[PDB]
Curated annotation (Swiss-Prot):
Keyword Cell membrane set for record: no
Motif mapping: Cell attachment site: 46-48, 88-90
Family: Belongs to the heparin-binding growth factors family.
Residue numbers marked as site, Important for interaction with integrin: 128-129, 134
CC per GO annotation: cytoplasm; extracellular region; extracellular space; nucleus
GO molecular function, one term: identical protein binding
Thermal dependence of activity, per record: Inactivated after 3 minutes at 60 degrees Celsius or 1 minute at 80 degrees Celsius.
Covalent link Glycyl lysine isopeptide (Lys-Gly) (interchain with G-Cter in SUMO1), residues: 95
Species this protein is from: Homo sapiens
Location of this fragment in the whole protein: 134 to 288 of 288
Free-text description of this protein's post-translational modifications in UniProt: Phosphorylation at Tyr-82 regulates FGF2 unconventional secretion. Several N-termini starting at positions 94, 125, 126, 132, 143 and 162 have been identified by direct sequencing.
The protein, known as: Fibroblast growth factor 2
């Protein structure tokens, strides 16, 4: 019965209350659930970024934070490392947060979200269909792998 994380997850608290983009829900971690192939993102301790269906993996607990305006700093709790994109397309994590760790979160009207790379706005973060990280060069429009659905771990 406990098959899951903690506290009933099926729920939609705060239906709105005027407030969705500004700070107001970045106090608790958020599970990044990808709609393409239904896969959750998970930063391995080795920095290798991948994805797994096990929604119980206590490693999927990524600590996200808001910064400036529209930008968001991602951080790993167990991995204790900040996500960072490379120049060729290899995605990995590190202990120090460099300017190559931000991601513009463009929320669309489909309740979904798209994390675009900053140092390289010519690509977006998207996984494949086996939990592998799609190269930053093979990523682009057309693929729905950019539709993310971060669920806040409130209740």
């Amino acid at each position: 019965m406990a098959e899951g994380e903690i506290t009933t997850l099926p729920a939609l608290p705060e239906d709105g209350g005027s407030g969705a983009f500004p700070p107001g829900h970045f106090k608790d971690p958020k599970r990044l659930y990808c709609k393409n192939g239904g896969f959750f993102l998970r930063i391995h301790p080795d920095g290798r970024v991948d994805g797994v269906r096990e929604k119980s993996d206590p490693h999927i607990k990524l600590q996200l934070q808001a910064e400036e305006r529209g930008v968001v700093s991602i951080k790993g709790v167990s991995a204790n490392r900040y996500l960072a994109m490379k120049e060729d397309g290899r995605l990995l994590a590190s202990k120090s947060v460099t300017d190559e760790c931000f991601f513009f979160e463009r929320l669309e009207s489909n309740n979904y979200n798209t994390y675009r790379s900053r140092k390289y706005t010519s690509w977006y973060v998207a996984l494949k269909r086996t939990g592998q990280y799609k190269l930053g060069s093979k990523t682009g429009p057309g693929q729905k792998a950019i539709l993310f659905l971060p669920m806040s771990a409130k209740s």
